[model samples]
Target: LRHTFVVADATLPDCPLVYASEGFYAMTGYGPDEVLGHNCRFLQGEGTDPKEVQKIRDAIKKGEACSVRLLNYRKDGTPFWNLLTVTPIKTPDGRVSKFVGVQVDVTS
Candidate 1:
């Protein structure tokens, strides 16, 4: 995909990430070996707002799509603002079995 994106396995406990696009690596400065199988929260740090994270969590719990602009820290400890969007990937039965997440730099 053109966007910095990742997919998390919602069917599994803790919803670990199963896929990460090249843009994810470019955006966060993290290699595939470092991010796959982990949750996305590691990108949160000093400037990340608790409320923003909670907003995403709330949407996840509801299996709903949402967008939030929040601060994220890169692998090298550099911080930037990101406009992140997360949406549920539904199964044939209409159950959310995975989540598709995307991010874009909004540091300006």
Candidate 2:
């Protein structure tokens, strides 16, 4: 599948990324070393809207699911509209332990 997958450590501050798929690397031109252990907000750039960012932040804080179209930048500074969806993943103990984010480039 060409879809991108990201898993964030819910126990970490800002839910830092714990895993990023090769599709993500291919889509953003960011190698594994540059992306892991950091929040996905790194993909946002100068023109990214703060409101959209806030929406995602609010959802994460509430351990809820959210979907938004965000303006994100690639490694080369190329802008792409990302259709992003983030969902809180619960552990066997019924605790929010991670977040799974799926991203698709919607730029045409």
Candidate 3:
């Protein structure tokens, strides 16, 4: 995702997730410490599909780029269309370390 609204993360792939960014907190209502290491999908509630969620996990497991659209909820329980795009980062030897995700809030 473009950091169009915040500071350019100098650390790139290793940049500590900014928990205090206004867009982060505004969209998810999660305090910084609470969101680390968790996919943003935790914001989705009981209505989320397990299979589709598993597809995301599977893609990451295989170190492939993934894109999908699904129904997801906000922290306040409002449902929205969640469009996700993620790509795996690799090392010189093709070792996959982390997946960078770009989530566009397509909610209406």
Candidate 4:
């Protein structure tokens, strides 16, 4: 239950992160200053599959929920399997207000 969580402002141009949990820094070695105001794609790197990335992108574009296992890299460049889940938060008027992402390291 100590998984990393990120909240991003959907109104922002790129849906930048508004908040990232301390667990995220511990897991990715990235402090709030480096992660805040940035998209989660920063974790995606060379070995990441485009298909998987597209799935997340498509969900975001459509304001839908998505969960995917992604190959992600830490700040120190160590690779790990990430179980990432993204959910869109909507306002009373049904507009996407924010996006919440839950990430857990599923690496053995």
The best candidate by TM-score is 4
Clashes of each: 0, 0, 0, 0
What shift in Å separates residue 42 of candidate 1 from its native position after superposition? 0.5
Each prediction's TM-score against the native? 0.93, 0.94, 0.71, 0.97
Worst 10 residues of 3 by lDDT: 2-11
- Per-residue C-alpha lDDT of model 4 across residues 33-100, encoded as one tens digit per residue: 89988988999999999999999999999999999999999999999999999999999999999999
lDDT (Cα, tens digit) per residue for candidate 2, span 8-105: 99998779899988899999999989998899999999989999999999999999999999999999999999999999999888789999999988
Q: Candidate 4, after superposition: displacement of residue 65 in Å? A: 0.5
Clashes of 1: 0
What does candidate 1's lDDT look like per residue over 1-108, in tens digits? 345888999998777899998888988999989998999999999888899899999999999999998899999999999899999989999999999988888876
For model 3, how does the per-residue alpha-carbon lDDT over 1-108 read when each residue is reduced to its tens digit? 521121212134442343335665666556656666444556666777777777876786677877776677666777767677767767778877555666667765
| Of candidates 2 and 1, the better by lDDT | 2
Runs with alpha carbons beyond 4 Å of true place in candidate 4: none
Better of 2 and 4 by lDDT: 4
lDDT of each: 0.90, 0.92, 0.60, 0.93
lDDT for model 2, please: 0.92
